[PDB]
Amino acid sequence: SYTVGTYLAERLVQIGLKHHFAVAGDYNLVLLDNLLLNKNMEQVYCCNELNCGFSAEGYARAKGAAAAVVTYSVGALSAFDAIGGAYAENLPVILISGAPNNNDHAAGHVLHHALGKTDYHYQLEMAKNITAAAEAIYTPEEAPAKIDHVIKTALREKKPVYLEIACNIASMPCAAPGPASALFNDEASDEASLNAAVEETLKFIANRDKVAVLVGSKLRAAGAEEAAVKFADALGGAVATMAAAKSFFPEENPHYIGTSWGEVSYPGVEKTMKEADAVIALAPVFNDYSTTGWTDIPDPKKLVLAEPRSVVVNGIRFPSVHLKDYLTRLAQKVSKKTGALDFFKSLNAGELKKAAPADPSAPLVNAEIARQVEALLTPNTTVIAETGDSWFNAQRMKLPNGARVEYEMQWGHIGWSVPAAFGYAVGAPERRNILMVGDGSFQLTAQEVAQMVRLKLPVIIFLINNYGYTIAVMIHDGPYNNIKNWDYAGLMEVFNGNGGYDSGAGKGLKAKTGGELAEAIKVALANTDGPTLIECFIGREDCTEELVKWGKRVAAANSRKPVNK
Amino acid sequence: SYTVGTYLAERLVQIGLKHHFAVAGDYNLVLLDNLLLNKNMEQVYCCNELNCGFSAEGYARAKGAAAAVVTYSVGALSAFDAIGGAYAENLPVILISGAPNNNDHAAGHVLHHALGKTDYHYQLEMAKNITAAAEAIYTPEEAPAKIDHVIKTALREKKPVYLEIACNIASMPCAAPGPASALFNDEASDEASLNAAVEETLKFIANRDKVAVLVGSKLRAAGAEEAAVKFADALGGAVATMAAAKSFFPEENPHYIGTSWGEVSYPGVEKTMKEADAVIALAPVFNDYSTTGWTDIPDPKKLVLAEPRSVVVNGIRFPSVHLKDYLTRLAQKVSKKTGALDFFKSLNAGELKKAAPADPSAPLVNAEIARQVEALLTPNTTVIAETGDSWFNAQRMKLPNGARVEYEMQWGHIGWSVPAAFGYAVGAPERRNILMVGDGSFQLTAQEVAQMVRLKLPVIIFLINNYGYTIAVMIHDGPYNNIKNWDYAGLMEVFNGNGGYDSGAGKGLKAKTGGELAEAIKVALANTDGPTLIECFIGREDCTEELVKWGKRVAAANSRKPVNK
Amino acid sequence: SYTVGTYLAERLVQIGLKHHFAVAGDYNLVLLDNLLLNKNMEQVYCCNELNCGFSAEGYARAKGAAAAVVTYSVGALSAFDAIGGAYAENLPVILISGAPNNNDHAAGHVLHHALGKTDYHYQLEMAKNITAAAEAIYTPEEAPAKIDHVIKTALREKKPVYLEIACNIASMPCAAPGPASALFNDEASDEASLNAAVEETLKFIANRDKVAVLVGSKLRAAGAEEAAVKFADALGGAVATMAAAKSFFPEENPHYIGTSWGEVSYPGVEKTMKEADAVIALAPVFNDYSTTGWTDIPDPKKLVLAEPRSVVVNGIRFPSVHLKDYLTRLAQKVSKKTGALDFFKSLNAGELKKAAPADPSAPLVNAEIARQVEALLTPNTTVIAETGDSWFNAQRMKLPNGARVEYEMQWGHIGWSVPAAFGYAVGAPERRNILMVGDGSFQLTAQEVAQMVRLKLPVIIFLINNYGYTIAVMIHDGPYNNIKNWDYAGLMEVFNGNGGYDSGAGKGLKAKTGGELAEAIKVALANTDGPTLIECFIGREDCTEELVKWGKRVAAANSRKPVNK
Ligand SMILES: Cc1ncc(C[n+]2csc(CCOP(=O)(O)OP(=O)(O)O)c2C)c(N)n1
Ligand SMILES: Cc1ncc(C[n+]2csc(CCOP(=O)(O)OP(=O)(O)O)c2C)c(N)n1
Ligand SMILES: Cc1ncc(C[n+]2csc(CCOP(=O)(O)OP(=O)(O)O)c2C)c(N)n1
Numbered sequence A, B, C: 001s002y003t004v005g006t007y008l009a010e011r012l013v014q015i016g017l018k019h020h021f022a023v024a025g026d027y028n029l030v031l032l033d034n035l036l037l038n039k040n041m042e043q044v045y046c047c048n049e050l051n052c053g054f055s056a057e058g059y060a061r062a063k064g065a066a067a068a069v070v071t072y073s074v075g076a077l078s079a080f081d082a083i084g085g086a087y088a089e090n091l092p093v094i095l096i097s098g099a100p101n102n103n104d105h106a107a108g109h110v111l112h113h114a115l116g117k118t119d120y121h122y123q124l125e126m127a128k129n130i131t132a133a134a135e136a137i138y139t140p141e142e143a144p145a146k147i148d149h150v151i152k153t154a155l156r157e158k159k160p161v162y163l164e165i166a167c168n169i170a171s172m173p174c175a176a177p178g179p180a181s182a183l184f185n186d187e188a189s190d191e192a193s194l195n196a197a198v199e200e201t202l203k204f205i206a207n208r209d210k211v212a213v214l215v216g217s218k219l220r221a222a223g224a225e226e227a228a229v230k231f232a233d234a235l236g237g238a239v240a241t242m243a244a245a246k247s248f249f250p251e252e253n254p255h256y257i258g259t260s261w262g263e264v265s266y267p268g269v270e271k272t273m274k275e276a277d278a279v280i281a282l283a284p285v286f287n288d289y290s291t292t293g294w295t296d297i298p299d300p301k302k303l304v305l306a307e308p309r310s311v312v313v314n315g316i317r318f319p320s321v322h323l324k325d326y327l328t329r330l331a332q333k334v335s336k337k338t339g340a341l342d343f344f345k346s347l348n349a350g351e352l353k354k355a356a357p358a359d360p361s362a363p364l365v366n367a368e369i370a371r372q373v374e375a376l377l378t379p380n381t382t383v384i385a386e387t388g389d390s391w392f393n394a395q396r397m398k399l400p401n402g403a404r405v406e407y408e409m410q411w412g413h414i415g416w417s418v419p420a421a422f423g424y425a426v427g428a429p430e431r432r433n434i435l436m437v438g439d440g441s442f443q444l445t446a447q448e449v450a451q452m453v454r455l456k457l458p459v460i461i462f463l464i465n466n467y468g469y470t471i472a473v474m475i476h477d478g479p480y481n482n483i484k485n486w487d488y489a490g491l492m493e494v495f496n497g498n499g500g501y502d503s504g505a506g507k508g509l510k511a512k513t514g515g516e517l518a519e520a521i522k523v524a525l526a527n528t529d530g531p532t533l534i535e536c537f538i539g540r541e542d543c544t545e546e547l548v549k550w551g552k553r554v555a556a557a558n559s560r561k562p563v564n565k
């Protein structure tokens, strides 16, 4: 039969989870015990609750959904930062929090781990601000509906949700869960709306032969990646990805012209976007970063805006239309509109200029690092790129079909990448998992590398030691951009603890030249029993020219003076 | 003149801050530039925002107030956890957050670091649940009043507060601040009430010779420690401390009888408390941990409750009576009530039983560690004691007058002790600052030690490596109590980074015998240029006797089934 | 083309509104101008915002949805009470509030009608607590998505929603709305779940022969009234209505046995429910009133709980199964379960005892009022029954098929009935609309009768003048149950204002005997050009027997002492 804990466990298993992440606390131990009863799913422990949140976030990037289990108050509050991130990056992370004994409610009881008042709903009220659904379970009878509600909502909305469970009811009997299919049940497109949206689009591009497609960072959340490819092949138009949509469209496809990102776009892309008479944006996010300081905004008179669940085209809004249906039907009706792609080719702007192989003995530079990492890409590779110049190194890489890049470009939490890489590697252990992270970001969440060691995850970490917050240096410089330098390579043996209670097979290596990097990479690819950190030493001013151009824009936008109102 | 930024800086300097803590972000960079302009204060940088909040918390325990500065969303949300802790521990920490350009407001703008919607009041709305005041500054004209409001509230209520500042107004001119005294202005005790409360207190104990005094954990926040010593000397009664009130009363005062903590009370203290005719609780916090699972609750018909700003005595409640004034006035009128103390001493229940110095060559045991640590205790010494068995090692120690213990027993966030020690040492560098932390807790926030090395703080760290969450093992045991063991001593040289971009003078030593421990403690004292981590190895089962007894009652309280209603 | 305002009006028209209700204020004037441009809809003006909210609520009962427009703060806050009522009664009311000029945002601007602070999100934040969706529109670009989102949520959830619109963008251009069918697009039942829930129900009642069906008060919201009689006819079991579900099932269907309401159930009904071995609860709301002070809770070991969007049966919970689809499939496969119906008939409990026609010249008594009112009931009739003895008067009436009763038994706001009857009459002017209201309730919202006069609505108002709050006198008597008597009949000539600026055709009559009432009812049916209020005079202690029995049990529940720990 079922308890509150094993009901939740079963639902998690039904939406496809093979792992859930947890930090033990006295308010969730019984719950953890009940989750553990389901041998179809593994309990993975993290160091702190922030890393736990980002671990699940990364896991959801690999498997589509995730779960994090923390304790009441002291656990959940730091996790909220990760949950906020999951929301911003449209990932269904289910955050489960232990909660006080339900006898301690409306009793006038001060409780440990809480604020010192007799109020026990402040955590729920906080969570409401950063989740698609949030529920507290204080009795077993209400458990099944609340669990089903939040899990259904997360999958439908592609947003994180919140659950708290009284510690003394986690083992209480409750109803059994029905079929898994009920959890994914969602409304189909309104047929009439779907047909009118497609027809309006054909009317719009009837005498606009220069059609460009702009791939956006919500395309995976809409499950519309495959459909985008059918539509593009049918259209024969020019296809560019927004920066945060890297790898959301096959780069070996003949219609792909590269990255669209204002003045830091691939060669010929900015001109082509300007020359197109119609722009079809598939699930874009336009914010201050993606529009390069509000300098690159799509011409509203040319824009066909196709969101996950609605289309605006030809001055008409069509709610209740799923992007994948709209793309699939459109791909069946559309004729060739090659004008944009023909214009792009007529530019002869050439491929992205990339640096030649560096002299192996010469001092290591950022370009030489990017070159060697790119050479590691395969159809089975995933690169995790941290906020920082790593954003731009990654954007410059040509991806073979199948290879993935993971960005956190809406939330932008430095340190996200380390736990996110951990969780991703747990979720997709069969892939070659590469983490590109700067020294500054790495310090926020570095202990999660020890969990990589613990689970023998062969993550390859390229640690860019440029000695400071360089991306911040290119926005606005000051003494707050300086940090304490670590011996990052030596940190691996610390996490191994060889000679201690347990063991580890992680390796840490330093690279000061192109030759030393190449040797380290060879060692990394041979390490199958643990992660390999490659500490790369480069100058502080040595970064992509993209970062410098983009940095000026961002700084000017942020700092622009108030307008009288 | 003054700007929004330099206005804030001046107010912080006026309330006695000599440092503030910060994590740079593109929404607070200009704010940070302005704070720097005031050289009467130093800007201290932290690894992540959680740590930064706890550093401010620790700093507040040393200086009486503190400030932390983070960036919007990604910074603030994780720091909320520390702020909640400051609320629970009655510490005026001022959290200042950068916020979006004020032109981005109601403009329909999606921004980096936000949830992907177009509204920016969720952070503030969350903040309101865990602060005594929360204000957003969107224009220069509003800044002074809002800054003054939150700071006055923080100091008066002894609670943390929240301020956010639009990033494009930090350098905007505003009014100059007035005299610092205005920030400490607080109401006096209502004279009529003060007198009535004291009189009612005299009537209540007129025929109750066995009066016992219970020192609670809000005593310092009430600024009433000195007045308690005066009242006690006048009463000549028996004085015991609650667990969290350790060092809030002089332990070599002839009226001090030890710790009152249910069945884990000092010898005879429990009997003396149950034998008393009248218990005078000074600023007590009665939660589930402090009452040992609701087993040791004060007798309601013996209790005089003297909270920080009110007194309940003899069935009458007297608001607007400051604890400090109450005790001082009471000290002038009270007569001798020695019965409880007389009863205590007759019991012949000897002093706390401590083990004799172990064989310096034999394997290290918990008792021995606590022995040498106690021998380091000095009137100049502060012990920061982490959640876990460190709580009880510290509770068992006799403190010379002047010696301080710092507990986070209401919030009980593990990992707190590391950044807290950092911030405390920054705020009290002349003191001998000792940190007693478990291996499990250390892993959550270990990177902040790197900041101890950076500022050359001679903190002495006793890391108790028993390989896991032993305290949780004594509440409810499971696989979630196990962790990845590190080489913690080796971590120090990683943080030093000698041979890298910079240097550090921290030391990492291992201690496995009572003898190895003794030599390490010598090396640690000899190290004045940085922190010293002493990794002590002991078994998992090797904990204090108190932890086990106490843990069972706590586990029982948390697990008790519901009652029909 | 469309403005923010005309976009809203078209969507309201599309979901089936022929009227919207409004109160003018300087923050919604231009919005009201834009709504008026759509001729397919009339704009109806109310006295105050509370009544305007309750008129929309009534309208929604008649037409399935409604909209109310009010001004910022002073209008909205009062209307929030009505909106909470719509949430409680599962009625999709759309509350649209004017809001400040969008230039006044984050400008440090104090505005009339607001709290005197400089921030303007408190009204939204409040609204979130009592709606299924709540959006603020500050720019014309975001309007269509937000308007579409709140309306679709309201229709899907059957709950009220909230919209505010900046007063200076109501005339601003925006996209055009797509096809109306988009707004009703909902998910279908999960086929595997639907079939599994059908089977589990069949297995559960395999040898549970005495099957009873309990019609609950959310059956209309679930759109499942028709599917309920299909199921009922197939099963051949006994069907009882919960008090609040009166008229949600055909009372001359051969399976109907009457009201199930504890010790005030119809004769035989209570014994039938106890005797049954299976109870099929259809969309029930079990609260303290419907369970008669928790004295009548359905046996959990025999309950099939079929909610609007889920089913719990045989220990298994089936989300994603619509009640309509569930009952329809069930009717196709279920076999005869007559046992409970056989049991009911064998009881020979007889019909509900009803008084014979009194002597016309004798003093009026409650039963005679209910008799004559019952005699007016027709297939074209709707009774609006106010909180108080009217509840039980209406509950006792036999309804011809077609006749409806409207209750507000979840929210229970006295005074609801007057505005509610107004909106209902506006939305169903063809029907015989009868309002049964106590003198106590009438005084709260009496002015809305003047609007009945204004639109010439032939509402028949029975005003039970027993001089006070009789229902509360039976709960717990005190001086707070006495009121100031009015001349309720003469109030009609006041609202007519004949001889003034306009005219009115309302009539007010007094009835002190059975015959006087008979005579007044005839002139009421004659009056086609306006409402007719009949002021009936009865004693304070002259109420239904059910009221006292029910009242005692309710007062017991609410006053019961607290539980220990
Ligand atoms: C939690 C959090 N705190 C602060 C920031 C602000 N921030 C953005 S980039 C950055 C610097 C990143 O440093 P590093 O990892 O060294 O990147 P790189 O030097 O390669 O640019 C900072 C502090 C953030 N994005 N998230
Ligand atoms: C953030 C947070 N997560 C979980 C807990 C619950 N908790 C209390 S003590 C503890 C174990 C502490 O481990 P350690 O530092 O090794 O203490 P020791 O084993 O010496 O008792 C945990 C997980 C907590 N207090 N705070
Ligand atoms: C706004 C509001 N205030 C108070 C109540 C509580 N209440 C319930 S019944 C009642 C008295 C109703 O008086 P009346 O309409 O004369 O009913 P009757 O005497 O006919 O039973 C009151 C005050 C309520 N339901 N709603």
Ligand SMILES: [Mg+2]
Residues within 6 Å of the ligand: A438, A439, A440, A441, A464, A465, A466, A467, A468, A469, A470
């Ligand atoms: Mg860096």
Ligand SMILES: [Mg+2]
Residues within 6 Å of the ligand: B438, B439, B440, B464, B465, B466, B467, B468, B469, B470
């Ligand atoms: Mg431990």
Ligand SMILES: [Mg+2]
Residues within 6 Å of the ligand: C438, C439, C440, C464, C465, C466, C467, C468, C469, C470
């Ligand atoms: Mg009455």
Ligand code: NI
Residues within 6 Å of the ligand: B105, B106, B120, B121, C105, C106, C120, C121
């Ligand atoms: Ni605003």
